[PDB]
Design a protein around this ligand. Structure first.
Ligand SMILES: [Ca+2]
Length: 354
């Protein structure tokens, strides 16, 4: 409560004018996305789920003025709500979950039940925005009203019983969805039944496609690759590629060569793996610009992916850097693999042709 021990501080500071808005061309508010907190601490470590204080602090531009702050209470919750049991009354079509309960602190914010209206013999919809050159896909979710006692009269008219989904959302955006498919072979019509729900582990993102199978003739470095668009503004399909040539990265999340990572031979042991990044002028490797966290493994690439950042979070300057890898095998000190990556985020210069 004293704000003495800070777990993270934004690397940039900001200064600006009052939102005085004398005419339209003067904004009435200012969004400062540089103050973004993503649950990672001052060294890149991940702070655990819990209660936090998100504190914004600033100074009037008057000398001798006390620093002002403003505190938002704020939860970290990475835990989906729980789906335990439900009751289905085949005599009313009445679907009634057990308790609403969340894992973590955010708490359950909403119950819902939906089936997928099949339209065009597909269950989703692709909408193309021809003016901003952007395509979006969205399910054809069609929902079932929630009665006041928290139950749902399932319209078995419109979708098979097992083709409904029960969805529970907590604040902070954890979602648990369960299709009613942990069912009973020949039980409708008869007595009410208690039904088991398990979250179907649906997701929004699916991470990079590995499929690489390292040889020893490889440096061990890997990076990403993606075909960068010319007209559209969707996110292109990116895949991993071995480096062993051209130790450079473009850290701009463009999809392409945005990070250096290390992957071991798939059957060698790298127990207690650590990646450190030092600068070109630190020829003794004392002071790391960036470091991996605990639990770094040579098979989880995100544990070793240096994205041209300092640990604190900000982007390194263009120039040469040292990416030093250390591990111990079935016998140890079989480490210190020294790569020298340079950065350069300047798009090249197309000269006119003949
Ligand atoms: Ca939760």
């Amino acid at each position: 409560k004293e704000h003495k021990n800070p777990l993270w501080v934004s690397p940039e500071s900001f200064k600006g004018d009052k939102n005085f808005n004398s005419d339209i061309r003067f904004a009435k508010s200012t969004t400062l996305l540089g103050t973004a907190f993503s649950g990672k601490s001052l060294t890149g470590a991940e702070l655990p789920d819990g209660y936090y204080h998100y504190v914004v602090s600033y100074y009037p531009d008057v000398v001798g003025a006390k620093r002002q702050e403003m505190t938002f209470d704020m939860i970290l919750d990475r835990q989906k709500p729980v789906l335990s049991q439900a009751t289905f009354d085949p005599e009313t079509n009445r679907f009634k979950p057990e308790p609403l309960k969340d894992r973590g602190l955010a708490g359950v914010r909403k119950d819902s039940v939906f089936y997928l209206e099949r339209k065009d013999n597909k269950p989703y919809t692709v909408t193309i925005n021809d003016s901003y050159k952007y395509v979006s896909v969205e399910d054809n979710k069609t929902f079932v009203e929630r009665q006041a006692d928290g139950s749902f009269i399932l319209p078995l008219d419109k979708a098979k019983l097992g083709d409904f989904y029960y969805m529970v959302e907590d604040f902070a955006g954890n979602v648990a969805i369960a299709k009613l498919g942990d069912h009973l072979p020949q039980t409708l019509g008869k007595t009410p039944i208690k039904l088991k729900l398990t979250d179907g582990n649906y997701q929004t993102k699916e991470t990079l496609k590995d499929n690489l199978e390292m040889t020893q003739s490889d440096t061990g470095l890997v990076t990403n690759q993606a075909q960068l668009a010319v007209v559209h503004r969707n996110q292109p399909q990116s895949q991993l590629t071995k480096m062993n040539q051209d130790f450079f990265i473009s850290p701009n999340e463009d999809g392409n060569k945005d990070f250096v990572a290390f992957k071991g031979l798939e059957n060698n042991v790298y127990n207690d793996l650590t990646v450190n990044v030092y600068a070109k002028d630190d020829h003794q490797k004392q002071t790391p610009i960036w470091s991996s966290q605990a639990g770094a493994g040579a098979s989880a690439i995100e544990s070793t992916a240096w994205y041209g950042i300092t640990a604190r979070g900000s982007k390194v300057m263009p120039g040469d850097y040292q990416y030093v890898v250390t591990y111990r095998d079935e016998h140890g000190k079989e480490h210190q693999k020294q790569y020298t990556i340079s950065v350069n985020d300047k798009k090249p210069m197309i000269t006119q042709g003949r």
